[PDB]
Amino acid sequence: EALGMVETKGLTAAIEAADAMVKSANVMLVGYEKIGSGLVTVIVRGDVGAVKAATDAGAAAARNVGEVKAVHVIPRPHTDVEKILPKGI
Amino acid sequence: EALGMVETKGLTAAIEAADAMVKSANVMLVGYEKIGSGLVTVIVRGDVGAVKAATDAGAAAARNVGEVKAVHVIPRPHTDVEKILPKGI
Amino acid sequence: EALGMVETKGLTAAIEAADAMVKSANVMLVGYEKIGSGLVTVIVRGDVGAVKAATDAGAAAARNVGEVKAVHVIPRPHTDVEKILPKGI
Amino acid sequence: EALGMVETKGLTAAIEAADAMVKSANVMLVGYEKIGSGLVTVIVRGDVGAVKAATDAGAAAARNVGEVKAVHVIPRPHTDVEKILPKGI
Amino acid sequence: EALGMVETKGLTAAIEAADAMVKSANVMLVGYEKIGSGLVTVIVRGDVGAVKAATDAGAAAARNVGEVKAVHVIPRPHTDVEKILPKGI
Amino acid sequence: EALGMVETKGLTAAIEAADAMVKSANVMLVGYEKIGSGLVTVIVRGDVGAVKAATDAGAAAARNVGEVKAVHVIPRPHTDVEKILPKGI
Structure with missing residues (x-):
């Protein structure tokens, strides 16, 4: 399954990204x-x-709340890359 | 329930934000x-x-005590976002 | 009871603040x-x-030893704020 | 066996490097x-x-996702150097 | 007993300060x-x-090895200040 | 026994220093x-x-891989200084 990443400087901007992400589309929040x-x-x-x-x-x-550094999408991450990502842990 | 966030550079400014927050309105302090x-x-x-x-x-x-970076409010955070926030833990 | 905070960049300046604090008045050192x-x-x-x-x-x-960032006093911190402060832990 | 290293400022750029690495050649991902x-x-x-x-x-x-700092290859790391590298731990 | 502190940016400069300290006078190294x-x-x-x-x-x-930030001496630290210092722990 | 230290900004440059160190002379790698x-x-x-x-x-x-900050040698570190260094731990 696809992988989505939003990187911010500051936790507040991150929480905003998280909320907006799950509310906007049918993606599951792995965490931060x-x-x-x-x-x-x-x-x-x-x-x-x-x-x-x-x-x-x-x-x-x-961007409205704080400083966004990186935004990227990986439509199909390699299986090995899976093990360095959490499941929600 | 609504979510409130005040982000500072320095713990002293944070403690001030915390105290002022709970004293000002009927919000429960989740922590920092x-x-x-x-x-x-x-x-x-x-x-x-x-x-x-x-x-x-x-x-x-x-702002009087130190450096405020971010301030944001989420009237109704998505349920998934709840699990990445503490209850006071 | 009142809350006192001295924030420094560097541990050396902090230790100096700590020593000078307890020696100067009848306050108990919670820690750093x-x-x-x-x-x-x-x-x-x-x-x-x-x-x-x-x-x-x-x-x-x-200030004589290092870099002081913040200094603040809270005459009566809210009870909720107590739980985010150590007792000396 | 050879050792490969890609160092980035930011986790997002790193994850991209990781995915692109394993997909591009027959290397095993030790982790980050x-x-x-x-x-x-x-x-x-x-x-x-x-x-x-x-x-x-x-x-x-x-580089497309974020900031790349270092990139290096060691065709045959000394055995002692092995013990300071993970196996995937 | 007296308290001595040497603060550096970098571990290498610190180790040099440590060695030079114990070799120069009869002080016991608490650690870093x-x-x-x-x-x-x-x-x-x-x-x-x-x-x-x-x-x-x-x-x-x-200073010869790296960057020295702070240097201070407390001839007699308050007893309360003792508990925030290690014994060598 | 003598003590050798190479301090870098970045893990990649460090790993290179480590490998080059053990390969160049008969020194044992304590770690990083x-x-x-x-x-x-x-x-x-x-x-x-x-x-x-x-x-x-x-x-x-x-220096070829990244940023070198400090380089120092202590022909005979004081015994007390030993206890703040790892054995390879």
Whole structure:
């Protein structure tokens, strides 16, 4: 299934991206990852069409609240890449 | 229930936002999250009217003590978004 | 009881603030919190008069050793705010 | 076996590097390491030819998503160096 | 007993300060603390005369290796301040 | 025994320093330490002659891959300093 990512500087902007993502399309929220430096990445899974719409809506909503750094979609992540992503853990 | 967020650079400014928030309106303090880089987000729950007043009072009080980065309100966060927020944990 | 906070960039300046605080007035040292980015906040509890004198003495002593970021006093923190502060833990 | 490394500022750019790496050549994804400051390093193992192609494809794909910091290949890491690398842990 | 502190940006400069401190005077190495942002503080205990000589020698040696941020001596730290310092833990 | 240290900004440059160190002279790799801010220090032990050659080779190799911050050698670290260094832990 497709992979969606919205990366922000600040947790507030992230939470906004998350909410806007799940509300906008039929994607499931995997959760958020923080790599320090105030960087937070929100991750969602679903069909490519859904994930694309969600990520667009997420980044849009996030820019209003804070600083958006990265936005990307992977229609079909390699299986090995799955194991470095959470299921919601 | 509504979601309120005040994000500051520095814990001191955050504590001020927190105190001012709960004192100003009938919101419950969920706690604070730190994503590194000195970024701290204070989270509260309550009715939209309460949360809005609290967050306004929080950011105002916080700017006097330190550096306010983000302030946002979500009147009704998606259920999936609930699980990435603490209850007070 | 009153709440006192001295926030510094660097642990050395913090330790100086701490020592100067407890020596200056009758406040109890709750400990120090670090939110990353080199930010360290020293926390004390006591009567408002004591905490005010301590924090003044703390920030003064700290500026000589390092970089002071924030200094604040809350004469009576809301009860909910208590649970996000340590007792000395 | 050869060692491949792609280091990015941001987790999103890293995930892109990872996916592009395993899809491009026959390398196994060891995982990613984060040393703070938003720095994330994706690690792969395989034959030198495979690892070289993967890392090229990884950095290329990553620059489109975010900020690439370092890209390196070690055809035969010393055995002692093995123990400071994960197996996928 | 007296308290000595040498704070550096980088672990290498810190290790140099530590070695130079214990070699220079009769102070016991409590260890080092890191508050993030690359800030590392080396802590020693002993008589004020010893600690003063050690810290001077520490900062001198450290500037040659890296970046020294803070250097301070507390001839007699308050007892409460003791509990926020390690014994070597 | 002698102590060798190579400090880099980024894990990739560090791994390169490590590999180049053990391959260049007869030093044992203690491991690497990260103090945040992307700072990583590679540590090796051996005879002073070996450690000196290793550290030279390490820093040289590391500058090609990334950013080298500090390079230092301690021919005979004080015993107390031993306990703040890993054995390979």
